[PDB]
Amino acid sequence: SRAVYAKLWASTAQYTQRRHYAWYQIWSRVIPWSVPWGIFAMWMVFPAMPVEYRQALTFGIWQKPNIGTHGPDP
Amino acid sequence: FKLLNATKLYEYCLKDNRRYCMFVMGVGLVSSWMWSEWWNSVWRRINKGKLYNDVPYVYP
């Protein structure tokens, strides 16, 4: 019947929308890889920043190294 | 082995490779910092009295 043939033709009318739904599915699996790569980036540029900023991103945990040199002058 | 398995570190941090790599980079960042700080303290204790900051210079 022509009615049946019409519904079969229309079954694939929303190709473009289904490709967009594919985009979402794949990008949701891939986007978490930004965290490992992000930690390493900050890890690399941390020593090139000022001392004042290095103590802020760590909540006062980080401090200058104490190796026993360059102490105050009497 | 029973104690390790009861922390659920495998289920939450090592079963998924994306999270496994988060664990590697994060733990390595913190561990490397504690390792250096500890070795500096040992160095200062063994060498007490010989380093520059331990003997203030007196002017004539």
Ligand SMILES: CCCCCCCCCCCCCCCCCC(=O)OC[C@H](COP(=O)([O-])OCC(O)COP(=O)([O-])OC[C@@H](COC(=O)CCCCCCCCCCCCCCCCC)OC(=O)CCCCCCCCCCCCCCCCC)OC(=O)CCCCCCCCCCCCCCCCC
């Ligand atoms: C069962 C088995 C058990 C076995 C036994 C146990 C095993 C384990 C034992 C391990 C013991 C330790 C072992 C030693 C390890 C450490 C030593 C070591 O390795 O040192 C390296 C060693 C020397 O180390 P070093 O450089 O002296 O170390 C200095 C420090 O790094 C000093 O660094 P720094 O001072 O410059 O910077 C430090 C700074 C660095 O700081 C930073 O960079 C960033 C700081 C700001 C972070 C801001 C974060 C903001 C967001 C916070 C979010 C919070 C959420 C809270 C949620 C709460 C929820 C309730 O960090 C801090 O200040 C501390 C951090 C405090 C803040 C807390 C936050 C931390 C970050 C957290 C991130 C997120 C984690 C979770 C993620 C997942 C969930 C989301 O180097 C060598 O030996 C080099 C040798 C030569 C290597 C040659 C390599 C090959 C060369 C050829 C290459 C070409 C060929 C290719 C080859 C490729 C091969 C692969």
